[PDB]
Amino acid sequence: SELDQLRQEAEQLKNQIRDARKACADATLSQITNNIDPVGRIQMRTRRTLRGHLAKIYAMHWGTDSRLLVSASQDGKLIIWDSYTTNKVHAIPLRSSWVMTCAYAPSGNYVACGGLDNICSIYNLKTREGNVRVSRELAGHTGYLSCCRFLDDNQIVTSSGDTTCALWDIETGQQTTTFTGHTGDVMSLSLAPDTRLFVSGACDASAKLWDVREGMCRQTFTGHESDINAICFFPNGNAFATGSDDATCRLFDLRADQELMTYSHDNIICGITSVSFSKSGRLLLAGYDDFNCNVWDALKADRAGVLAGHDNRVSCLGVTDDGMAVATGSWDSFLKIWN
Amino acid sequence: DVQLVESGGGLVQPGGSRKLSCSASGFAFSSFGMHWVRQAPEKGLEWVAYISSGSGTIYYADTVKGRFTISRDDPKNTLFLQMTSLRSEDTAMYYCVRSIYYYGSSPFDFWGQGTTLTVSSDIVMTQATSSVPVTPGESVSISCRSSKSLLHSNGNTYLYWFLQRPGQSPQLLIYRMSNLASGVPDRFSGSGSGTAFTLTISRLEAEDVGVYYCMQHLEYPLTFGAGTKLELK
Amino acid sequence: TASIAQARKLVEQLKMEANIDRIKVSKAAADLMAYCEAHAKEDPLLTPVPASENPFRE
Amino acid sequence: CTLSAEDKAAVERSKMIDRNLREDGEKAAREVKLLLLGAGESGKSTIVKQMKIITGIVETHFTFKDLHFKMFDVGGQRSERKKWIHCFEGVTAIIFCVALSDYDLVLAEDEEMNRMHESMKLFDSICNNKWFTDTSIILFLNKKDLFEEKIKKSPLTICYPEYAGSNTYEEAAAYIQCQFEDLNKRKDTKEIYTHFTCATDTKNVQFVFDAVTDVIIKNNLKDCGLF
């Protein structure tokens, strides 16, 4: 009587949104960027290899200084490497050896990690006692934490496998603003440069944009045909790129509320695990699971180059804040710095 | 809290042998490299010895090389300095110094309390200002010079600023310059040009008086310049 | 009763997503195009940096 | 050596960290990692109670014959399995527990599919998974006595219509075992070790130790180029 009416109303709204998006597609990003000189071949070499892990590396995150990066591996260790000297600054033992995320705080005082234990553990790097202590174990998620990101030293956003994203108060240790709306498992979230909005790519083939103080989903982005595994904002903050299991990267723009262009190749039939943008936003480095990472031009579908040198699936890669290096962490226990 | 209680000093006849023990509590002694710093009854600070984590690297001063030995016992959280054939030049206050070395670390951040002991090619660090009078609320500028440039090829210039209040152990103010120690206020600031270095305090209080020591960590042995005494008017 | 409330939340979310203001792709694409052109000089990946200024020399 | 004193001490600290990491890796490499993947509640707790101890994921530690073990009761995840099942790639074996009493019961949630058919589907899904091609499976068929009394009082044709054997316990158990083992499409790079356990059984740990030693010996022989 009413459930069918509600479903019909939802379908009519969905068609209305689809009609509205089409009216805004006067041109395409590929058509506009036709008269632009291609970036050409990008020959990035493995400058410095970071060895010492003994298991599969599932996540890494650079620091603000663009010199220190953290690495999370299945062996229960969290090494803070010094990329300039290939030095292990810290080795953090973990109570849970199953980790899927690790985040470096902008100030460098704290690092986070999480995984199948369903707890985000915040570790205090610089203190007295000369050790790294578990500052806070954030609990409340009912699923594995796929990705966590620091807003500041006290607020952290976490995505988990309960189809829910959460915003935490580290000092209080209590979930502050739950983010509901996803249908499948949330696999990755990225924070905007202004730390105001964040987009989470879930296993429902959709990426949703959220507002921090409001908890509402401003707008949802669809177009993928498989599970979204990676996500990353444009440096501007008005667009983001998603990585899925269908060998496809899609650049969604927030203001037009639709997809700009698709980075797909017929040769590639694997999935995509990690996606990041360069400092200028022209190159989209996507970490595929066919032992390779592909450097995609953001404005043109052409592939600039391929980052080869990993003997297993590439699981995590991110560009430094100054854009001077790319560090790809793969399933084989090695991190490679590329420039 | 973090503390370093050191004992084992006293009246020693010349030519004897007495060892110093430094008990470490409130921090991970194993991961910290420990130093011994001397202080004559009325002279400046002098570096003595240094033992790293795991005793991998051990260094001595030229005046104590082959004569003193330094060792640590990590399970017992203690530091040892066995001194042999003590002379009249060893009568001084020996300080237990805590140091760590990673990127962004703060070496020489914590000091002991002193051990009263009495006996019956190196970079020269200079501070011209022996005494400086000042009133509270003013601004000072303590100047220290080096005989060799301390700006390494990696961009890190190795100079450390310490403050020794009357009757208290030295406290780290500013490690490799333009870096503020964890705990000291924002009044202190340091700058330099490879050879000439300065420390500036914006506003002075009654607790900022004492003697300021500049130290170099570019290469062993570590050398302390003669301190600059700050006295109220 | 069990799911009649869930559908209303979905309808409200779709209503909120529908009323947002949208700009044409031509304006949106130009802004990304303009952003890349302005910041192209300060992109070490796009334009290789001389070894003197490259921290990862070896 | 074109390095400052602090740089040399940082290198020394990195070497000590690497030494500790190597020690931890040597300690962990001598431990056996097992993944517990029982279907629902088909006697998944009786086995861990029998093995003793010496939140989404549960780790059970027990030592037998100076050998450390690592069981991971990951069934309390309630998420999409294939998004985290590759974390367990490289475990020595998978301990799959199936209750033989489920041949009469029907899943409450569905009320249509037999519980043992659901267990068979889960076994098929996990045995032929790409991440677990070379990982042997230790099959546990619990509820021996309750299945005994059922098969004495009730027939097995409800769960397996294409059954020709008698109602005796031995033939029924053999048929269930061969039906479960037939689901293994990797007859060459995998082995299934099957044991029938009850509530009072105490040789389950010894059976698991034998199976794990067999798996490790086969892996070592393959690694040393002898197979």
Added chain:
Amino acid sequence: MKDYMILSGPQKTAVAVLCTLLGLLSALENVAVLYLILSSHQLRRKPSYLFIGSLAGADFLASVVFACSFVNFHVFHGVDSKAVFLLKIGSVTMTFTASVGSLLLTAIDRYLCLRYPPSYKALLTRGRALVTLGIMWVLSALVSYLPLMGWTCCPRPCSELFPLIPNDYLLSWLLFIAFLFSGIIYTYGHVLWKAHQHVASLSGHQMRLDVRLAKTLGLVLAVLLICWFPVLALMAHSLATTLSDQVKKAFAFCSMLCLINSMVNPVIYALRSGEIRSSAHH
């Protein structure tokens, strides 16, 4: 030393073509397996496969040096200088002894694969693989290059079968390699016994592992003791008597059993490995 080159006749062409053919193809097989192991970039991290590579390299060196020296010294009748003929004999003996030592290293690796299953990865690591391999190479070098250092057959008459080497040293090295075959024939005894113990223990609750190990190890040992027993037996028997019959010619013919063992080393050892087969296919 002309009496040592007593083998001649129309069979010279046959022995020459046999020597050159076996040496060429054995060197080809050994260099192919060496390249396949090195270029894989994954077999290097495996301690067993570097022992297999040591076997391959020792076999390649042995085949090349033995074939070249034999064709230069016997079929071509090119007499060598007394200073360098001893060096060439030392080189061929060093390569042969290193090959046997690599066989024993693979044997003890296969033993450790069963005696300490869970700790096998940690007991023999990549770092420890070379230190035991390097010591074997130099030890096999010194026992064979001892004549090069200070031994010029000064005491006791030189052996009849081997020119310019004493009967005293012949028993000395043969004892060294007899103990070296003693190790390889004993550790495989423990591998087959510990497999027998393990197979029976698991079958108690409810033989293929025993059968497979028996087949592979029996093939290895049968090849070794059918390609090395004749020459060692002749060497041991030559100590007692002068042995100046056609037995020296028979020894010259059967010395190519060493090259036969060299040919069969890859097929038996590496080509049997699944990873070698996969890497060769790819």
